[PDB]
Amino acid sequence: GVAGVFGGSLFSAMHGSLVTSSLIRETTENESANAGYKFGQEEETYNI
Amino acid sequence: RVRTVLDMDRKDPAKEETVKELRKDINN
Amino acid sequence: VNILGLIATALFIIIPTSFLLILYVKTAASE
Amino acid sequence: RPNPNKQVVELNRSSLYWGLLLIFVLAVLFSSYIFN
Amino acid sequence: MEALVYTFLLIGTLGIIFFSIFFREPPRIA
Amino acid sequence: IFTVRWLAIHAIAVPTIFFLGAITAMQFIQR
Amino acid sequence: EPGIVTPLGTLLRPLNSEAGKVLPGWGTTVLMAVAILLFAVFLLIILEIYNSSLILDGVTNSWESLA
Amino acid sequence: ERPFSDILTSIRYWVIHSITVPSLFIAGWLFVSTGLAYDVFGSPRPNEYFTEDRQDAPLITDRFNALEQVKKLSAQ
Amino acid sequence: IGTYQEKRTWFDDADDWLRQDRFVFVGWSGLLLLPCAYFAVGGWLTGCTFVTSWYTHGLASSYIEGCNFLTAAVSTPANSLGHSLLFVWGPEAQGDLTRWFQLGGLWAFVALHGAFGLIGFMLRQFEIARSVNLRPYNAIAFSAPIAVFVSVFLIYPLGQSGWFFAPSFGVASIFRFILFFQGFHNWTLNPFHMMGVAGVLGAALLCAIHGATVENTLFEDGDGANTFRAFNPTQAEETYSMVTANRFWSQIFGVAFSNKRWLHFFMLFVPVTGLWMSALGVVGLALNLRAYDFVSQEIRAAEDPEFETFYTKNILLNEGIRAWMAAQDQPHEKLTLPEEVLPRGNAL
Amino acid sequence: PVDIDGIREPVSGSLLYGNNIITGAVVPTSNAIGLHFYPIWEAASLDE
Amino acid sequence: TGRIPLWLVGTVVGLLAIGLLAIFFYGSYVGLGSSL
Amino acid sequence: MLTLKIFVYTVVTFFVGLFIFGFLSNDPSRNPG
Amino acid sequence: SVTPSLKNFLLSLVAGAVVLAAIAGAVTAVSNF
Amino acid sequence: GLPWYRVHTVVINDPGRLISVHLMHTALVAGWAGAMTLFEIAVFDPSDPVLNPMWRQGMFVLPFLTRLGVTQSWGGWTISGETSSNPGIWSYEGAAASHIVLSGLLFLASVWHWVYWDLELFRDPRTGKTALDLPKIFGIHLFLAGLLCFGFGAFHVTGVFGPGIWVSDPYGLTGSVQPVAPSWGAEGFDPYNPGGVPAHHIAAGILGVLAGLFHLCVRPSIRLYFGLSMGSIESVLSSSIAAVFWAAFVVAGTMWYGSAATPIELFGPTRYQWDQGFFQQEIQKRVAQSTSEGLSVSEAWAKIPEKLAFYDYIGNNPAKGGLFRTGAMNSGDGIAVGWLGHASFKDQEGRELFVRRMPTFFETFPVVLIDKDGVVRADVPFRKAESKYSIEQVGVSVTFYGGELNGLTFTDPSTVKKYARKAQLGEIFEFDRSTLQSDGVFRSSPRGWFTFGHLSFALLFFFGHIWHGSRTIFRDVFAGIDED
Ligand code: CLA
Ligand code: CLA
Ligand SMILES: C=Cc1c(C)c2cc3nc(c4c5[nH]c(cc6nc(cc1[nH]2)C(C)=C6CC)c(C)c5C(=O)[C@@H]4C(=O)OC)[C@@H](CCC(=O)OC/C=C(\C)CCC[C@H](C)CCC[C@H](C)CCCC(C)C)[C@@H]3C
Ligand SMILES: CCCCCCCCCCCCCCCC(=O)OC[C@H](COP(=O)(O)OC[C@@H](O)CO)OC(=O)CCCCCCCCCCCCCCC
Ligand SMILES: CC1=C(/C=C/C(C)=C/C=C/C(C)=C/C=C/C=C(C)/C=C/C=C(C)/C=C/C2=C(C)CCCC2(C)C)C(C)(C)CCC1
Ligand SMILES: CC1=C(/C=C/C(C)=C/C=C/C(C)=C/C=C/C=C(C)/C=C/C=C(C)/C=C/C2=C(C)CCCC2(C)C)C(C)(C)CCC1
Ligand SMILES: CC1=C(/C=C/C(C)=C/C=C/C(C)=C/C=C/C=C(C)/C=C/C=C(C)/C=C/C2=C(C)CCCC2(C)C)C(C)(C)CCC1
Ligand SMILES: [Fe+2]
């Protein structure tokens, strides 16, 4: 169980960081990058 | 004239971690 | 802590809440 | 003459809810210790 | 009086949860 | 061969086998 | 717009005038490395003395030094 | 770099390693059995934990001269 | 570089060699990571195999002594050595490698090499991210484990009387460290371990929920009952329906993500914040600024002999832990407590 | 307060009885009950 | 390099690993660390 | 206390009956597919 | 020098310089092949 | 549409408003210094320098003001306990007023440098765009810093022009602001040697000037210029954050372990003085020396200063405290009034018994009275049934030498148990707790609070180094990435 929660934290951080880093440039500076993604984008906004 | 042996034997009961005990401990 | 802790808790509740509400109202009025 | 670096801060409602929740949860957590 | 403060804080948290559930900003598709 | 991958494999293999032999020998000690 | 001209600004212009000027190659990076090396050794000596891993002849490293 | 499957399925790799992997294993077994491990890493043998006068666990209790203290506390 | 590349220098050759995409990327950070990490792990294995703690903690903590993987541990040195760095050439070991092992210098060796290995690994993450042109969010995330390691294995022992109270590198030794923290510092009651627990449990919750939701909102994209084959690494369309997931969690839970970037940033954010808060709490404990007691309840219990809460029972448990563990956990104290002074319940 | 251990030593767990959020709790059922089912209508009064 | 199929190598290595683990458990029940 | 018991029995029976007879009323055909 | 610990410290500096130069020379030799 | 956590980036590319905001932070810091000094002076009790010094009352800026030379006050009282004949303008109130007026002046200057942001000084003479020559700026400001460091080391602390710094005896009994002679030998690196502080601040300062003259004359090389991202202000921010958290770690370590710059007469004792019996050994050595002179025990203990005994008390240990045990040390434990004396415990046989002192780790510690040979002879048992080393069973009596109870012997078991429990904490003192309504739990001394605060800041600023430096190196991709 300890290995599971530590692995959950590790893999959550790892996956979130990888997806956030791979997030393709659809929004420039002067605003948050979250504006680049749209709820109906129906496409991968990150370079897997 | 201070008896160093008695000084150490007084500090040890109250506090065994005193630097008096640990200094030159292998000599004892 | 009868009063000093009470004042600390009240300020910690009030100041950030007022800041956030003011920012949200300004945002909603501007856009 | 006006400063070109002027920008406007924005705060959507989800951010407002997150901030209020953070403030009140921190108050809940630390109020027991503050009153001691 | 401490109980009053704790109850107020819990009520505030629950009210914030209620507003965030039933008065959320609609998720805008595209 | 003796490439970087060769060194990376053998830095964790030779000590590993030596220690496995050591631990196996330890398994048959009488106090 | 041209900006604001003030006596202090005119006085201090030369200090900020040559912005971006560099030297070809690595320049004085080798001397920088030597200085960094010596500083690391110096900090190591100081940490050793304070940690008592480096006993010195005239250094007591204790409150008795106040005497 | 050759794929691992090609190397691990190659007869040459196995004939090379079948005299070295057992050699390392036997080296480790000899290292433990011949008493070298105790000699170099200083872990006391099962009959060396307690001396004639020290019938309890040892205590370093000294910052400097700790070499002499641990030497006299260890098995002689 | 910018205006021109000038001439190729020996640094250029070294960079070109180190930056090659071989099986094991070394890079410039490798020169610090590989030796330090290799020596740290090898030192832990040698210590858990051959090195003992008979002279440091008066405990047998190696395989050759009869310990297993659970109970073997590279124990921290004796308390009388204080915060000595315990160099193998230092004034303690004075060059005797065997005695340096006996004095516990292997713990300092492993800890320092591991700290520099963690520095090298974050440097490796930065270097690799820069090579592939990605925002180095994973190095920023890995800052949290570095903070935990620094605050627990370095800051905390330095705040105490010596390395002796650091966590010894082992399983049962870590468990001893945990129980010691509960008994002495009342670490559970500390709001910073509370925030750390919340962060770690929330991170595990997010991992499980995101995995399940993605695996249960997949688009068909294939005719086989094995849904893993119906995916191409280079495809552009999302493999799962974000709209369906948002609707499902909105109607089940009340609120739901509507932004993939925000979702994954939240997944990154929760555990890092939890670990950083726990690290701040551990610093506070290093100074013994423990959130041990609520003085109001202690005063009320002292005045009122019938007022009892779970907090007071926890205080009694901590008292028992301290009294019954002090004698053997801290041999340097030489605590020969008679059995009549140890706190104890009834008929137990 | 609730006599959790069944030794007639009640434990206070509510805010009104001098507890904060950290120490407050809903005390488990009395040890005298054991695994017995204890609905409201089983007790003689709300106080019990 | 098709000789000595990879599945055979894997099976033999796994058998050796399981045997080593069993030897370790046996040593856990006898000799040093056996509580007798 | 008897009145409370009979009231709770009525409530529980009502809700459990709703559950049982709602999952029987052609539930598997209530999917979009 | 005066203190044995100082002599050991200086020898440690020399040894660390030796290993660092060994790493640098190794990377240079492999880079130039 | 800047998010709330990016608003203060508006001045990233505006040098004038950067000056303005940095002026505002400086003004706020100076105002805090002045206001904190005023509050501390208002709530400070200067009557009793012994048994009630600054570190007992929770003073935080008074230790630093006293350390650097400011000792007197306009109220007629001196921190050393004498009378203020002429405190001058550099009293505590003077320092507070000066920092306050400086805060106001910096506020006005911040307003001005904010309104007139578009100064031609910040324009690149060639291109006409706004730019800052960061290498030259660092050279200038480093030259200034080195000049000031040398000036402080050579004139201040040495007393050539300044007043000196706080120098004390090893046991913190007689300390005062004195000029310090520089230590140019190896002993200048003894952390507890005061003479290192001038010499260092001299030599280092000199180097700074020379270093300035280099980083002001010699332009950085192109490879180094692009490698270290010189020309981006955020690179400077990353490097500065790193340096500042390094310095925070150093100062936290040097205060927790104590040094010549953090005397115990201003911040209180360290926990390592209690752990190693720094004061207990000295007290017993003085007692033994007096006994060897032929004096009785009562006279030998009466010769012990009360301040030295007060240091030998676990309530003054900085590591006996709580995170939310707030306020002055007097708020937890009462205000010290006097020294009861030294308690000597003796069994009915006449064998002298010593009470085992509470280690710093233990919130509660059982009472054990130990023979000279480390053999437990008595205790306050937890199980009074079939006890073996009970006070009544062994017949322990306590005689007090010196202090308030001088030559007084108590034999009733209740009083002996009470005094043994008190003596497990160190020297026994009388405390007046009614004045401040002390609850009865130990607080932490100002050195503990300083170390905790600056260590937490050091960790957070390590994360700051990481974040702002990652933003520096990856500036091109931190606006987004173009896939691979
Ligand atoms: C002197 C050091 C320093 C300086 C000059 C800056 C400057 C900056 N930071 Mg940075 N940072 C620092 C240290 C510093 N930081 C440290 C130590 C950390 C680790 C905690 C961070 C972590 C950090 C993050 C994660 C981010 C920045 C960002 C930024 C930029 C925008 C800041 C902003 O507008 O937020 C606005 C601030 C507020 C709206 C108020 C927040 C209130 C806080 C939570 C509590 C109030 C503190 C209290 C009043 C003052 C006490 C602090 C003092 C005792 C130290 C800005 C140029 C942002 C950026 O990258 O720009 C794009 C951003 O994302 N910083
Ligand atoms: C690092 C800087 C620093 C340090 C080391 C100190 C240290 C000290 N201060 Mg001080 N102070 C500071 C900055 C600092 N202060 C600043 C910036 C101000 C201006 C506001 C003050 C104003 C001030 C006053 C008015 C007083 C002190 C006092 C004291 C002394 C009492 C001990 C104490 O702090 O109680 C305990 C400290 C704490 C419990 C703070 C814990 C920090 C927690 C973890 C923050 C978490 C907040 C949380 C996230 C939010 C939720 C809480 C919410 C429910 C309210 C002590 C030596 C007192 C004194 O001795 O009188 C002379 C006193 O009355 N200070
Ligand atoms: C016990 C918990 C725990 C472990 C064991 C662990 C382990 C690891 N995490 C890594 C990564 C990460 N961890 C991350 C977030 C987290 N990690 C967490 C918790 C853990 N993470 C948590 C809670 C989070 C959330 C914040 C991130 C974001 C990353 C990565 O990017 C990275 C990765 O790629 O993962 C796949 C790997 C890279 C480490 C490495 O090779 O360094 C180099 C080797 C070194 C430094 C030598 C180790 C020396 C150590 C420090 C001291 C000696 C330790 C002994 C050898 C072992 C003692 C064992 C006993 C105590 C039982 C490694 C497998
Ligand atoms: C039927 C069961 C009903 C009970 C469920 C209760 C639901 C709780 C929802 C509250 C969320 C509060 C945040 C609002 C803000 C909010 O939710 O905005 C909605 C947000 C989705 O927003 P977006 O995806 O548009 O976010 C992107 C934005 O940055 C702008 O694009 O969802 C989330 O952020 C994650 C969901 C919250 C994760 C769970 C929250 C856990 C907190 C629990 C608090 C415990 C208190 C205990 C009482 C003392
Ligand atoms: C300390 C020191 C050093 C170093 C050393 C080293 C680096 C070593 C290495 C070492 C090593 C590197 C070792 C290894 C080990 C390994 C092992 C010991 C193995 C383990 C494994 C196992 C036990 C298995 C398990 C299992 C089975 C049986 C079944 C299935 C599953 C699994 C696989 C899990 C030096 C020189 C610096 C000098 C000084 C001191
Ligand atoms: C997991 C896995 C693996 C594997 C591993 C291993 C190690 C295996 C083994 C296996 C095995 C190794 C198995 C075995 C089998 C056997 C059997 C199945 C037999 C049976 C028998 C019977 C049934 C009968 C008996 C009898 C009796 C009853 C009586 C008398 C007579 C006799 C004895 C005959 C691999 C790599 C592939 C990969 C994938 C995964
Ligand atoms: C305008 C002007 C003036 C002046 C006035 C005045 C009177 C000023 C003052 C002002 C002031 C009077 C200032 C002060 C400030 C303060 C500060 C700036 C502080 C703050 C605080 C903080 C920031 C803290 C935070 C925290 C807490 C609360 C809790 C724990 C943690 C911590 C510590 C972080 C004159 C006349 C010269 C004339 C000219 C103009
Ligand atoms: Fe994902």
XYZ file of N, CA and C in Angstrom, chain B residues 16 21-27, chain H residues 61-65 68-69 72:
48
model
N 24.991 11.762 30.985
C 26.035 10.923 30.413
C 26.562 11.471 29.098
N 32.561 13.515 29.821
C 32.698 12.069 29.692
C 33.349 11.689 28.370
N 32.908 12.309 27.276
C 33.308 11.850 25.953
C 34.744 12.232 25.626
N 35.240 13.332 26.184
C 36.613 13.745 25.924
C 37.591 12.745 26.524
N 38.517 12.262 25.697
C 39.531 11.295 26.114
C 38.887 10.079 26.774
N 37.855 9.550 26.122
C 37.119 8.428 26.689
C 37.895 7.121 26.567
N 38.603 6.917 25.454
C 39.354 5.677 25.288
C 40.473 5.587 26.313
N 40.966 6.729 26.790
C 41.992 6.711 27.825
C 41.468 6.059 29.097
N 31.267 6.364 22.102
C 31.431 7.403 23.120
C 32.712 8.227 23.013
N 33.155 8.548 21.798
C 34.305 9.432 21.645
C 34.387 9.922 20.206
N 34.661 11.217 20.039
C 34.736 11.802 18.704
C 36.097 11.549 18.067
N 37.148 12.107 18.649
C 38.503 11.768 18.258
C 38.966 10.585 19.091
N 40.091 10.000 18.703
C 40.543 8.728 19.256
C 39.506 7.629 19.081
N 41.092 4.292 18.054
C 41.593 3.438 19.125
C 40.452 2.805 19.905
N 39.383 3.562 20.146
C 38.256 3.020 20.893
C 37.610 1.861 20.148
N 39.970 -1.222 20.204
C 39.982 -1.977 21.452
C 38.630 -2.610 21.752
